[PDB]
Curated annotation (Swiss-Prot), chain D:
The chain holds residues 859 to 907 of 1248 of the full protein. This is Spike glycoprotein E1. It comes from Chikungunya virus (strain 37997). It is a single-pass type I membrane protein. Disulfide bonds join C13-C45, C14-C47, C19-C29. Residues 35-49 are annotated as: E1 fusion peptide loop. Class II viral fusion protein. Fusion activity is inactive as long as E1 is bound to E2 in mature virion. After virus attachment to target cell via host MXRA8 and endocytosis, acidification of the endosome induce dissociation of E1/E2 heterodimer and concomitant trimerization of the E1 subunits. This E1 trimer is fusion active, and promotes release of viral nucleocapsid in cytoplasm after endosome and viral membrane fusion. Efficient fusion requires the presence of cholesterol and sphingolipid in the target membrane. It is found in: Virion membrane; Host cell membrane. N-glycosylated. Interacts with spike glycoprotein E2. The precursor of protein E3/E2 and E1 form a heterodimer shortly after synthesis. Processing of the precursor of protein E3/E2 into E2 and E3 results in a heterodimer of the spike glycoproteins E2 and E1. Spike at virion surface are constituted of three E2-E1 heterodimers. After target cell attachment and endocytosis, E1 change conformation to form homotrimers. Interacts with 6K protein. Interacts with host MXRA8; this interaction mediates virus entry. The interaction involves 2 adjacent E2-E1 heterodimers.
Swiss-Prot record, chain E:
It comes from Chikungunya virus (strain 37997). It is a single-pass type I membrane protein. Signal peptide: none annotated. Glycans are attached at N259. This is Spike glycoprotein E2. Plays a role in viral attachment to target host cell, by binding to the cell receptor MXRA8. Synthesized as a p62 precursor which is processed by furin at the cell membrane just before virion budding, giving rise to E2-E1 heterodimer. The p62-E1 heterodimer is stable, whereas E2-E1 is unstable and dissociate at low pH. p62 is processed at the last step, presumably to avoid E1 fusion activation before its final export to cell surface. Coiled coil: none annotated.
């Protein structure tokens, strides 16, 4: 979820993508319209 | 007790402006619990309701004549007046000014929605 | 708009008889109907309100009835001063209109 | 790097909604109750529950 | 080309900080901020449209924004962007802004209205450009060496990334109703309205002219405007009009990537 290799593909022109990040939806706040969520940050940026 | 008496000539030329001023006696239009109405009776026809006005200036009219009829208010003179532009030869009739109270009633029984006081009227002549 | 009609268009009866006039509306108006009496040269005067009760100060000989769409005006006994013109009027939904009326004459 | 896609929410008043499954990666759906959203001119829907 | 913007309209949305520490509904609102380039150039998305007047004619000096139930025009000279110290604006088109800015921890945008009123919105953010080479430096030198690098291109050509437009939902507005001594009145001003009251009779309809309701107080009715002729972006901050959306068209995202040296 948070290291090198969270997103994988076989070639830059391919359509098949594998993903293993965490995604959980949470309750909206009172009086507001929005879609909050929680997710692990990208692993490629961390490696750089 | 409130009584209604009018003023204004009942003789007008065609396509001109017909104006009827109904003055309040023993009362005032500053009251916020009453409407103010104008009604006509054509020869061979019953009473035709034209609409009503409110003391602040709120207005609503009959769909047929709304394109021409315009009501106003005169608090200092304690009067309410009607103005009907583009009069026709078919507009010769007898008019009456009347009043009615409005309030939040319940149980389907109330005095609301009925004309309680009436004027004397005029015989309008629309001719050249 | 609510369309109203009255029957009969004319009334001819002697002194002491019972006179009944019916008012029919094209739309439901529940308990919103009244009765107005018009003298010659004068404006109509309301005598019946709430479609059943009579106006205060009016003699008790006048009464009303009917419900839903058909309403009947009932006078217990005709009198010389009752020969006038009578109308009905509804008070449920705007715009508010009037009936065609009926003329009462001595038989 | 990756991107996340979020389409507009669906608000249904005086009723209950439901969702079906799909084959897209990392798909998720959920339903919440007891909402009373507002907009700039006043409340959205007439029902208060 | 600007032909793709002919049938669209601006919109309103929520903003977390209005300048005094409270929330508000604002005609300018922030979407996602992209920082993929290695030279430290930012790409911003807003809710107003730049370069187009109300009659779909091109003009570089004008922008249009959404007022209450109607669009209007304003001047470009008032547009500003800052993240602590002020930024420098390099290019604009439609919903998008390209800028360069110093390091900081906040980001704010603002503009000047048609009646001499200012607006602003603020979001948290973390900005720190990456380092190229084996030394850290603050400005461009006169004598040096060249290394590979990446940037954004000032081009308005068609690209392969697209966003969609849908039909707007109904818009409530309380001020339409007025109270006058025992009855409630409705004013229209030339639009379609949809009303529903829970009093006696359960009156409901779809009117285009003024009406009056008898013995039906306020605090029991609802109103909205329902006849629309333009399309709108499906922001995650506005509710859907129907269970299945009706797609009408799409527009493209400009300013693609390229290789350069620094």
């Amino acid at each position: 979820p948070g290291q090198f290799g969270d997103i994988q593909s076989r070639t830059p022109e391919s359509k098949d993508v594998y993903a293993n990040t965490q995604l959980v939806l949470q309750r909206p706040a009172a009086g507001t319209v929005h879609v909050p969520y929680s997710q692990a940050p990208s692993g490629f940026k961390y490696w750089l | 007790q409130v009584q209604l008496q009018e003023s204004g000539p009942g003789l007008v030329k065609p396509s001109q402006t017909l104006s009827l001023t109904c003055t309040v006696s023993g009362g005032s239009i500053s009251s916020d619990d009453y409407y103010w109405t104008w009604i006509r009776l054509p020869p061979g026809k019953g009473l035709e309701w034209i609409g009503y006005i409110f003391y602040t200036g709120g207005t609503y009219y009959n769909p047929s004549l709304k394109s021409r009829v315009t009501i106003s208010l005169d608090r200092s003179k304690n009067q309410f007046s009607l103005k009907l532009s583009s009069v026709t030869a078919a507009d010769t009739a007898v008019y009456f000014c009347a009043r009615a109270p409005e309030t939040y009633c319940s149980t389907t029984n109330c005095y609301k929605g009925y004309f309680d006081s009436w004027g004397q009227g005029t015989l309008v002549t629309v001719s050249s | 708009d609510i369309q109203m009609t009255q029957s009969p268009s004319s009334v001819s009866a002697s002194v002491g008889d019972r006179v009944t006039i019916t008012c029919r509306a094209s739309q439901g108006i529940s308990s919103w109907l009244g009765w107005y009496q018009q003298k010659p040269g004068k404006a109509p005067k309301l005598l019946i309100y709430a479609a059943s009760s009579l106006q205060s100060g009016v003699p008790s000989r006048f009464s009303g009835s009917g419900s839903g769409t058909d309403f009947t005006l009932t006078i217990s006994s005709l009198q010389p001063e009752d020969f006038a013109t009578y109308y009905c009027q509804q008070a449920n939904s705007f715009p508010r209109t009037f009936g065609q009326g009926t003329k009462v004459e001595i038989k | 790097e990756y991107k996340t896609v979020i389409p507009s929410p669906y608000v249904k008043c005086c009723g209950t909604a439901e969702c079906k499954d799909k084959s897209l990666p990392d798909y998720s759906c959920k339903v919440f109750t007891g909402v009373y959203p507002f907009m700039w001119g006043g409340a959205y829907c007439f029902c208060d529950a | 080309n600007f032909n793709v913007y002919k049938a669209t309209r601006p919109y309103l949305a929520h903003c977390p900080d209005c300048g005094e520490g409270h929330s508000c509904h604002s005609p300018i609102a922030l979407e996602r901020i992209r920082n993929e380039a290695t030279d430290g150039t930012l790409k911003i998305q807003v809710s107003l449209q730049i370069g187009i007047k109300t009659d779909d004619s091109h003009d570089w000096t004008k922008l249009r924004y959404m007022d209450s139930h109607t669009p209007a025009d304003a001047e470009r000279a008032g547009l500003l962007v800052r993240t602590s110290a002020p930024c420098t604006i390099t290019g604009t088109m439609g919903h998008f802004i390209l800028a360069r800015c110093p390091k900081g921890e906040t980001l704010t945008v603002g503009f000047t209205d048609s009646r001499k009123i200012s607006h602003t919105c603020t979001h948290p953010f973390h900005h720190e450009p990456p380092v190229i080479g084996r030394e850290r430096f603050h400005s461009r030198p006169q004598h040096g060496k060249e290394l590979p690098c990446s940037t954004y291109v000032q081009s308005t050509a068609a690209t392969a990334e697209e966003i969609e437009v849908h039909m707007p939902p109904d818009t409530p507005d309380r001020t339409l109703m007025t109270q006058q001594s025992g009855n409630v009145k409705i004013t229209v001003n030339g639009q379609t309205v949809r009303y529903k009251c829970n009093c006696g009779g359960s009156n409901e309809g779809l009117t285009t002219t003024d009406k009056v309701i008898n013995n039906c107080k306020i605090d029991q009715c609802h109103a909205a405007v329902t006849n629309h002729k333009n399309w709108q972006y499906n922001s995650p901050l506005v509710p859907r009009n129907a269970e299945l959306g009706d797609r009408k068209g799409k527009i493209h995202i400009p300013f693609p990537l390229a290789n350069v040296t620094c």
